[model samples]
Target: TLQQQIIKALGAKPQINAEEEIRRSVDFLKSYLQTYPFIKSLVLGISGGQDSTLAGKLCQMAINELRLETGNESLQFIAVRLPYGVEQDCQDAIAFIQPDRVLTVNIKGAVLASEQALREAGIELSDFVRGNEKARERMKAQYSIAGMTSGVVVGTDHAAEAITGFFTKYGDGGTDINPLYRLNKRQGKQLLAALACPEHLYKEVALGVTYDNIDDYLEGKNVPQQVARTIENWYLKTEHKRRPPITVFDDFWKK
Candidate 1:
């Protein structure tokens, strides 16, 4: 009962057929775009990670399908590389989507520019704070480009990231729609494989030993008690990040 409740609340169901998930995810993307005719393109920042790579692929699939159905050759899927500096592994990220236009907006200057302005105000920030600035800056570029190019920003957030609140709020978490919203990390990898993504992109261990048995933990399979507790604690702590901003007018919020 406990496991079932947790799974339902987190939206992380381990019992899934990869191909079916792929079909549904792509369908959602297509339907979402069709619902909003004004959005001409689907834009995403390809970090070369599995999540972004998978999201990019799904968005492209939708874009191609929409072109056929609506006869709108203007429909496009744009992937931007928002790097803080010269990222060594950028090519691998590029190799995933191979987007039509890979606009390289080095965020190092933008990030430093903000940091410098903060210093001018007699305020000092830590390296950790600056890292968050980088993530926020990347999202700024994504939204700006999307606005200028007449597109919508596609996000890479999934169940696992949602559970842990791993994304910077209003940073990587900001987007028009998330195709992979209900998928967990393991399920995300499965979707990537089902979509024919490269082996290295999905097979690599991105989160270290802590995430080695994430599928088992989230799926109600056998997992260490401590690991389970830690994840649960994180979920509770990050409860705020999962919701819309809290407004003081509380009851007056909904129309």
Candidate 2:
């Protein structure tokens, strides 16, 4: 069944020990970083959201352990704050993560400038498209920082968000590494709790599906017929987001 197939593809499990998962995720980040001798830092945007908070904490843990293990004092975690104008809750994330460094980049001007450029070209952007612009600009800032710091951008994407295609194509979805890939939403919070970081879902309402149902489905548990159908439909529709860009060498014309 596609449900099971998706579960397998996402590597979702029915049960997980939060402490064990946290260790694995931290080790994953450390190992990935070790592969690149030139990388000296890890970068991620902290939105004070559950996902970002968890990923940020994991990054800090990894870098701290990596520095001790390799005796590389230069290893660091740089948590970035990318807000459109002002974000009231950002301090919570910054305080919780306690990254080695913090950088704030206001994206309001860039987003507005892009909007004005489109309007000048006789194009009007809706509120939805404008929201995507904010996401892309945030990613742009993170990438610029990563380039400057010889770091890899970290993503907060997990199984639940991946299943729903909840991220923008090259926006929040753009990153050099993701430590939370195999976990679901609930698992993310659990891992955070294990790390002693204290938490929080917005994508559910828009999709008419809760993360509970999504996580259950991913874990191979039974869900209502309508719920399962909605998930599968979304997975099919958003397959492009999960795949590489198509090219003529793929023989699209033949299909």
Candidate 3:
């Protein structure tokens, strides 16, 4: 079944020890960074949300371990605050993650400029589109910082969000690495608790399915019939977001 297939592809399992998963995630980041020795930093936007907080903490942990192991003080975890204007909760995230460096890039100007340009071209964006504009602008800021520092932009995507395609394409979803790829919402919270970070989705109302149901499905548990159907439909609908751009030879248009 496609549900099972998606579950397998996401590498979700029935049981996970929060502490063990944290160690694994930290190790994964360290190993991936080592592969690209030219990369000096791990960059991520901290939104004070559970996903960002968890990923930020993991990145900090990885860089701390890497610096100690290699005796290289150059390795850094840069936690970026890409706020449209003012975001107060991110300070809590900063305090908990304790990253090597913290940078703020207010994205309001850029997002507004782009919106104005579109408006001048006789295009008016809806509120949802405007919200996505904010998301992409945030990503743009993170990538700009990463480019300047020879770092990789880390993403907060996980199996639960991935299954529902809750993120905007090339917006919050555009990232060089995702340390939380295999974890679900509950798993992410568990990992954060293990790391001593306080925890905290809107996609449920839009998809008519809750994260618990999604996580259960991903963990190979039997979900309600409607829940399974909704998830599978979304997975099919958002296939393009998960795949590379289609070319003539790609067969994506085949009957």
Candidate 4:
């Protein structure tokens, strides 16, 4: 009962611990230096979206002057906006990420042409399929380019996505490191707030970055909305993401 109360008070559930999350992020990045030994660069897919924007910021902070002095290394954000992804998102992504290069790797022609070919061949499908395909194509470019540059792929995947299993697995799911894996959407909003990103962009990302598929139905799914306001409530009520569950085994161990 005490454990449950503690968990409820801290606002962590399903393995969320704010202190642990932030510490893990910092530790993960720090450990990379030791593990890789010669890692020269870190790369991120900047989409002008909140997730990647926050991730890019995290990567930047993780290897600031102190670490750079010792590791002789640094992080590099990469902006690769695809055709379907918002144009404003593209511009904002570049500006916010402030990546080394805002390269245009257009896969629209290929994606559109292939989808068109499919339609002509009588394989009918909605724009959603084609749109997602383009996003995947962009990933191909990001990963390939990151590989060429010998950089790790820093990404925006967080607890909400992971717990609900919302990603396309290897498509938008894979990353060298996820800086905000344990953070729910509301927590993300707070982090973005601290960053002081443009208000319009922040609000756009805060609520607008949603599951378009479910928005249509009269009653949507549980996970998304709970992942939303509930996260916000957690932030306001509990100063942190809460803490880990109390270990029952500790009771036995206490002599």
Q: What digit string (tens of lDDT, one per residue) describes model 4 on residues 1-255?
A: 332332343333443344555556766776775578556566766666777777776666566633566756344445555555326765775676565555676676767777788989999768767656766776687788878776777777765544334455455766667677646565665666666666666561234445321121111233455444543443334321122334764442243
List where candidate 4 sits over 4 angstroms from the true fold.
Answer: 1-24, 71-75, 116-124, 204-255
Over the stretch 1-255, how does candidate 1's per-residue lDDT look in tens digits?
A: 555656787788767898888888889888877888888888899877788888888888888778888899888888898867775345775666666667878999888788789999988889888778888998999999999988989898877777677778888888888888878788888877776777888772233425545567666687777766677667667766777877875542354
TM-score of predicted structure 1:
0.90
Tens digit of lDDT per residue, candidate 3, span 89-131? Answer: 6777788888889988889999889999999999999999999
Q: Please give the lDDT score for candidate 2.
A: 0.85
Over the full model, what C-alpha lDDT does candidate 1 score relative to the true structure?
Answer: 0.78
| lDDT for each residue of candidate 2 in 1-255, tens digit (9 for 90 to 100) | 889899988898988999899888888888888888899999999887888888888899999998888899988999998877875456776787789999889999999898899999999999998888889999999999999999989998899999988789998988888889989888887777777665432126355789899988988899999999998888877877877787866642243
Q: Count the backbone clashes (under 3 Å) in each candidate.
A: 0, 0, 0, 1
* Residue 229 lDDT, candidate 4, scale 0-100: 52
Give Cα distance to truth, residue 24, candidate 3, Å.
1.8
The root-mean-square deviation over C-alpha atoms between each candidate and the true structure, in angstroms, is 3.6, 2.3, 2.2, 10.3
RMSD of 3: 2.2
How close to the true structure is residue 97 of candidate 4, measured as C-alpha lDDT?
52
Error of 2 at 152 (Å): 0.8
Colliding residue pairs in candidate 2: none
